[PDB]
Design a binder for these strands. Structure first.
Length: 167
RNA sequence: GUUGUUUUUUUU
């Protein structure tokens, strides 16, 4: 947790030119990479921004986090050290009680490790949960643990066995 | 009974 940031939810048509102007506005930028699939060069939808000062980095988070750019809302946060340990940490859960909430998810899945991002898919019309959700842990061991502890078991408040697998 | 994130969080 220092100067390196990971920018998420970037519109596909965002150029390095844009990333720069946007983040440069906070303080001097060391580097700005958009991360796109080699060959086709299509944005993986995220980027890293290495500021020069730990202070500038922090402030970027405070100001740019959540700002809307065209169709998306950016999500700026400190990058976690890479590695094999961050691998296979995204979970695809289904058969979740339809009365589920972000706080229950936290209770159920938060004991096995530290959640980095979670999303309860909701019906666009009703706004009610569809029973699906994506939970992304910090370490690869937490997801594995989460999986074996919750797969095929009935969650509290529900009458149906959860389904937890790697996305 | 096949629900899939603001499709895409580790350097593409």
């Amino acid at each position: 947790s220092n100067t390196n940031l990971i920018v998420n939810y970037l519109p596909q048509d965002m150029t390095d030119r844009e990333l720069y102007a946007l983040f440069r506005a906070i303080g001097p930028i060391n580097t700005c990479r958009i991360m796109r699939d080699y060959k086709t060069g299509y944005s993986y939808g995220y980027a890293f921004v290495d500021f020069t000062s730990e202070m500038d980095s922090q402030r970027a988070i405070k100001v740019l986090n959540g700002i809307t750019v065209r169709n998306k809302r950016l999500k700026v946060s400190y990058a976690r050290p890479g590695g094999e340990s961050i691998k296979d940490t995204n979970l695809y859960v289904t058969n979740l009680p339809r009365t589920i909430t972000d706080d229950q998810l936290d209770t159920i899945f938060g004991k096995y490790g530290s959640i980095v991002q979670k999303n309860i898919l909701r019906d666009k019309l009703t706004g009610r949960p569809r029973g699906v959700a994506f939970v992304r842990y910090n370490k690869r061991e937490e997801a594995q643990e989460a999986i074996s502890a919750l797969n095929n078991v009935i969650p509290e408040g529900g009458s149906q066995p959860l389904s937890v697998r790697l996305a």
